[PDB]
């Protein structure tokens, strides 16, 4: 044999490499081979399905590079008698409305974004920054629902703790990566010279990291910057550095659970026509910082660091 695909939009992120590793484990346990394909754009996405069909795969797990390709992915898979489960990014129709009929495995995005804002606030308090010279830089990808629900949950948590609404600045990024976030943050930074300390809000580690690299390029030292990412496994190189930076820590969800559990449920669907729940929300989360990242990853089975 049974072949299943595991398609991810960004193979460069440790987040997806970890889903790939745990899907392989599910394969070993249940007796199936996992075909690992990178689908960074819509065209590679449709061509990879064709490719899956030529290898005899019976279904695939996918994290789409664009939620709007949902209809087409479903259409091509139905054509090849393949089942599909989405992992992390939900499929939406042309109008941006959720395609509720494709089983989805994903993190509790709002809750994790809210924890990000609660932890930003906490560290800010511990540093004693004066709120009057502080501000939040929120790097958003609003067209991606999962991303939007994390950055909105984070801004909402900050506003709820008392961070002044008018000191929250949003800036859209063109790409969910360091270069995109960098660009975005750099453009906001020169517009606010009055700010002496920044909170950086981003849906994932790469976005917060681009934001931190920009603050360093504008003269901010690490004590005046607080950024907390989301993914965990993606921030290990940052947290491993000799010196501390404005990247304080990351919220470690469960990519191991997403890789193994979406592969297992696919397998059960394809091999026993056992229908997966439509929605699996994983609430797992732990704050990893320079002080505990090695222990927390080893405790989750993601050894090395
Ligand atoms: C949970 C995942 O959500 C999206 O797909 C992000 O782009 C990934 O980096 C990861 O944070």
Curated annotation (Swiss-Prot):
* CDD domains according to UniProt: PBP1_arabinose_binding (cd01540)
Task: List the top taxonomic levels of the source.
Answer: Bacteria, Pseudomonadati, Pseudomonadota, Gammaproteobacteria, Enterobacterales
A Gene Ontology molecular function term for this protein is:
carbohydrate binding
Gene symbol here is araF
Q: What does this protein do?
A: Involved in the high-affinity L-arabinose membrane transport system. Binds with high affinity to arabinose, but can also bind D-galactose (approximately 2-fold reduction) and D-fucose (approximately 40-fold reduction).
Q: Which UniProt keyword terms apply here? A: Periplasm, Signal, Sugar transport, Transport
The induction annotation reads: Induced by arabinose. Transcription is dependent on the transcription factor AraC, the cAMP receptor protein (CRP) and cAMP.
Which Gene Ontology BP annotations are present? L-arabinose transmembrane transport
The species is Escherichia coli (strain K12)
Write the protein's name: L-arabinose-binding periplasmic protein
The UniProt entry, under InterPro entries, shows: AraF, Bact_Solute-Bind_Prot2, Peripla_BP/Lac1_sug-bd_dom, Peripla_BP_I
């Amino acid at each position: 044999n049974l072949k299943l695909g595991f398609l991810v939009k960004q193979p460069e992120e440790p987040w997806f490499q970890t889903e790939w590793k745990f899907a392989d484990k599910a394969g070993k346990d249940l007796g199936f081979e996992v075909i690992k394909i990178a689908v960074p754009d819509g065209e590679k996405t449709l061509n990879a399905i064709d490719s899956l069909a030529a290898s005899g795969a019976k279904g695939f797990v996918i994290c789409t590079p664009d939620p709007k390709l949902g209809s087409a992915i479903v259409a091509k898979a139905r054509g090849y008698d393949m089942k599909v489960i989405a992992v992390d990014d939900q499929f939406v129709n042309a109008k941006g409305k959720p395609m509720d009929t494709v089983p989805l495995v994903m993190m509790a995005a709002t809750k994790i974004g809210e924890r990000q804002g609660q932890e930003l606030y906490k560290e800010m308090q511990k540093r004693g920054w004066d709120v009057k010279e502080s501000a939040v830089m929120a790097i958003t990808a609003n067209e991606l629902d999962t991303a939007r629900r994390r950055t909105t949950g984070s801004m909402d948590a900050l506003k709820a703790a008392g961070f002044p609404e008018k000191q929250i600045y949003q800036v859209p990024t063109k790409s969910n990566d360091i270069p995109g976030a960098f660009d975005a943050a750099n453009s906001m930074l020169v517009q606010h010279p009055e700010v002496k300390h920044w909170l950086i809000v981003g849906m994932n580690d790469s976005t917060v990291l681009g934001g931190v690299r920009a603050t360093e390029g504008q003269g901010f030292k690490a004590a005046d910057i607080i950024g907390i990412g989301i993914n965990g496994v993606d921030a290990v190189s940052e947290l491993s550095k000799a010196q501390a930076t404005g990247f304080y820590g990351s919220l470690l969800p469960s990519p191991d659970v997403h890789g193994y559990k979406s592969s297992e449920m696919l397998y059960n669907w394809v091999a026993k026509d056992v229908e997966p729940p439509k929605f699996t929300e994983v609430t797992d989360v732990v704050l990893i910082t320079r002080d505990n990242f090695k222990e927390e990853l080893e405790k989750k089975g993601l050894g090395g660091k």
